[PDB]
Write a protein that binds this ligand. Structure first.
Ligand SMILES: [Cl-]
Ligand SMILES: [Cl-]
Ligand SMILES: [Cl-]
Ligand SMILES: [Cl-]
Ligand SMILES: [Cl-]
Ligand SMILES: [Cl-]
Ligand code: NA
Length: 129
């Protein structure tokens, strides 16, 4: 599923991301825009052989099992395919774990490079929330 901006903001709000570890909802919607273009089906291979999955591009090195990333962990205890669902529950629940790990939203390269320090409230402007 390719979300609209506000549709994703509502879905993220309802699943408890708004202000989660102190990151306002705009930061999550901004991260999703630049990680996946709001596409739950997005996948991208990394050089190390891991793959990033879903609307928030969660990596199989640490967070999910894809059966082809040797010596990786699955800290979210999910198949990576779960992160591609049109239902973002798995993605959000795994994102909560990531963001809690110590490095905050710096775990998302696109957030650090394109969202951090920017006017992220722009991403939820006009939305009914
Ligand atoms: Cl929308
Ligand atoms: Cl915000
Ligand atoms: Cl992989
Ligand atoms: Cl699994
Ligand atoms: Cl959802
Ligand atoms: Cl933080
Ligand atoms: Na893994």
């Amino acid at each position: 599923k390719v979300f609209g901006r506000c549709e994703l903001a509502a879905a993220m709000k309802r699943h408890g991301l708004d202000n989660y570890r102190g990151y306002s909802l705009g930061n999550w919607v901004c991260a999703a825009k630049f990680e996946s273009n709001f596409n739950t089906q997005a996948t991208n291979r990394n050089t190390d052989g891991s793959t990033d999955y879903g609307i928030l591009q969660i990596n199989s090195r640490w967070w999910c099992n894809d059966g082809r990333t040797p010596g990786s962990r699955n800290l979210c205890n999910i198949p990576c395919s779960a992160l591609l669902s049109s239902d973002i529950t798995a993605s959000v629940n795994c994102a909560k774990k990531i963001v809690s790990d110590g490095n905050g939203m710096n775990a998302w390269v696109a957030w650090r490079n394109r969202c951090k320090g920017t006017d992220v409230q722009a991403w939820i402007r006009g939305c009914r929330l």
